[PDB]
Design a protein around this ligand. Structure first.
Ligand SMILES: *[C@@H]1O[C@H](CO)[C@@H](O[C@@H]2O[C@H](CO)[C@@H](O[C@@H]3O[C@H](CO)[C@@H](O[C@@H]4O[C@H](CO)[C@@H](O)[C@H](O)[C@@H]4O)[C@H](O)[C@@H]3O)[C@H](O)[C@H]2NC(C)=O)[C@H](O)[C@H]1NC(C)=O
Ligand SMILES: *[C@@H]1O[C@H](CO)[C@@H](O[C@@H]2O[C@H](CO)[C@@H](O)[C@H](O)[C@H]2NC(C)=O)[C@H](O)[C@H]1NC(C)=O
Ligand SMILES: *[C@@H]1O[C@H](CO)[C@@H](O[C@@H]2O[C@H](CO)[C@@H](O)[C@H](O)[C@H]2NC(C)=O)[C@H](O)[C@H]1NC(C)=O
Ligand SMILES: *[C@@H]1O[C@H](CO)[C@@H](O)[C@H](O)[C@H]1NC(C)=O
Ligand SMILES: *[C@@H]1O[C@H](CO)[C@@H](O)[C@H](O)[C@H]1NC(C)=O
Ligand SMILES: *[C@@H]1O[C@H](CO)[C@@H](O)[C@H](O)[C@H]1NC(C)=O
Ligand SMILES: *[C@@H]1O[C@H](CO)[C@@H](O)[C@H](O)[C@H]1NC(C)=O
Ligand SMILES: *[C@@H]1O[C@H](CO)[C@@H](O)[C@H](O)[C@H]1NC(C)=O
Ligand SMILES: *[C@@H]1O[C@H](CO)[C@@H](O)[C@H](O)[C@H]1NC(C)=O
Lengths: 259, 49, 49
């Protein structure tokens, strides 16, 4: 009943920079090498849009390979994108993780989940009704709950030495179809000792309705980008805060500024 | 080893010590008081005979 | 129990809690009691003598 996704690609501008170390600095330029999102690279966009003619719903949620990190952006309203699923096969043969944050509170679970076909949360913008994410979970190792109740939301996912790293940022924007442009820095929020082999991830969606037992559609979009091994340069102010950065493999002025 | 004195610096929320470009420690949060201090070489300057 | 047969080598601070038949020749296998099937876990023997 769904429609073939439009795998359109926009330009990533100068986004995707995060904090790579926990040392404290003041007015220092530091050159590093790591796994970062390259400047001005194709960012693949998936959309959730209202049906017009019939069962034309664009309910995008494929399996996107993790590779060596992930950058995930969301432009939406009324909190349609809520949670993430990490795993290897995403079956009940291998342990998997769900990192839901909305709903009652942030629920972080590592179990042997048997997921359904559409990880869709059947709720609305408030006073939620049901929850459709699981079918069975036999052997659970980690269960944590954190007390907590058009925009731009940014996340970065990494997996190093058995630790899952999650970085987050938020901004308020106004746009219709294109992708924004600007500079953002991502602060470290989450670091979890899970120690599992992550090769695939999937998103969780919600279907807003009008006080009815039938649910359908919303207006939103989420963007995916993959990380690559690069070298970059960063700048720090008096009180530690990244003000700008450069990509030392983009254009000759960049290697000049990097040498 | 050195003299400890009162401090007027600002620390970014949780932070235990601060250094400089030469990696010389010059500040500690001195727990049980939480009042930032300053460290200084015992002798610094110059003495001629 | 400790795992005896695996295709690749694990990475630091990473665990695997799987139990699937390991085909010597190739990728997948879903039937034991064969001439080429090998369970991936073997049991220690801590007896008295
Ligand atoms: C994370 O988890 C994924 C699985 O979800 C792991 O991916 C597996 O990776 C292996 C390669 O290391 C891949 O191929 C298997 O191994 C051999 C090819 O490399 C093949 O079997 C072998 O064939 C040889 C030649 O005949 C033979 O000599 C040898 O004895 C063996 O029979 C075959 O292609 C295997 O499938 C798996 O397909 C792949 N599984 C997947 C993708 O589901 C990944 O390695 C894990 N990462 C970490 C860090 O552990
Ligand atoms: C570092 O922090 C200080 C303190 O917040 C900033 O100085 C303040 O700047 C604002 C205006 O942006 C003034 O309203 C405050 O009165 C200032 N306070 C002090 C103590 O100076 C400073 O701009 C920040 N600088 C960096 C490097 O981010
Ligand atoms: C560590 O313990 C010391 C006491 O041994 C605490 O210092 C006292 O703090 C109270 C206020 O909470 C004051 O009324 C006392 O006058 C202090 N006495 C001394 C000896 O300093 C200190 O606050 C404790 N630190 C923490 C973080 O609780
Ligand atoms: C994005 O993809 C198009 C089509 O392959 C390509 O022409 C364009 O150069 C790509 N953008 C980048 C990252 O250069
Ligand atoms: C497609 O139809 C099935 C019927 O069970 C339904 O569960 C699913 O939600 C529909 N597609 C979407 C993405 O809504
Ligand atoms: C495991 O998952 C598969 C696919 O959903 C299912 O066919 C099987 O019955 C499940 N078995 C268990 C252990 O629940
Ligand atoms: C869970 O672990 C127990 C051993 O503690 C094992 O007997 C059981 O089969 C496991 N279940 C699954 C499907 O992980
Ligand atoms: C941009 O702002 C206008 C006016 O507030 C609003 O109607 C529109 O929904 C915003 N962008 C989108 C397409 O969400
Ligand atoms: C109310 O529900 C109807 C479907 O019964 C829908 O077409 C309409 O857009 C909804 N309006 C509101 C107030 O959400």
């Amino acid at each position: 009943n769904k429609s073939t996704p439009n795998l359109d690609q926009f330009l990533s501008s100068r986004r995707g920079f995060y904090y790579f170390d926990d040392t404290f600095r003041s007015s220092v330029r530091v050159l590093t090498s790591g796994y970062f999102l390259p400047f001005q690279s194709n960012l693949t966009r998936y959309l959730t849009l209202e049906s017009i003619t019939g069962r034309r719903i664009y309910f995008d949620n494929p399996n996107i390979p993790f590779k060596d990190g992930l950058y995930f952006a969301a432009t939406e309203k009324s909190n349609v994108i809520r949670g993430w699923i990490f795993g290897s096969t995403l079956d009940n043969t291998t342990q998997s993780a769900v990192l839901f944050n909305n709903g009652t509170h942030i629920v972080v679970n590592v179990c042997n989940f048997n997921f359904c076909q559409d990880p869709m949360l059947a709720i609305s913008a408030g006073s939620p009704y049901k929850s459709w994410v699981y079918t069975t979970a036999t052997n659970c190792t980690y269960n944590r709950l954190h007390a907590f109740n058009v925009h731009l939301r940014e996340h970065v996912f990494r997996n190093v030495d058995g630790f899952l790293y999650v970085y987050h940022n938020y901004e308020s924007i106004n746009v219709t179809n294109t992708f924004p442009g600007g500079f953002s820095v991502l602060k470290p929020i989450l670091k979890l000792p899970f120690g599992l082999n992550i090769t695939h991830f999937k998103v969780i969606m919600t279907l807003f309705s009008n006080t009815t037992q039938s649910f359908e559609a919303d207006a939103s979009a989420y963007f995916v980008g993959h990380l690559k091994p690069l070298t970059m340069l960063a700048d720090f102010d008096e009180n530690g805060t990244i003000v700008d950065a450069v990509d030392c493999s983009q254009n000759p002025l960049s290697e000049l500024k990097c040498t | 080893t050195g003299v400890l004195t009162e401090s007027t610096k600002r620390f970014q929320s949780f932070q235990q010590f601060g250094r400089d470009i030469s990696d010389f420690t010059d500040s500690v949060r001195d727990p049980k008081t939480l009042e930032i201090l300053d460290i200084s070489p015992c002798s610094y300057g110059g003495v001629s005979v | 129990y400790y795992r005896l047969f695996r295709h690749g080598k694990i990475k630091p601070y990473e665990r695997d809690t799987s139990n699937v038949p390991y085909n010597a020749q190739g990728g997948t296998c879903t039937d034991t009691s064969q001439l080429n099937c090998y369970q991936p876990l073997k049991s220690y023997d801590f007896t008295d003598t």
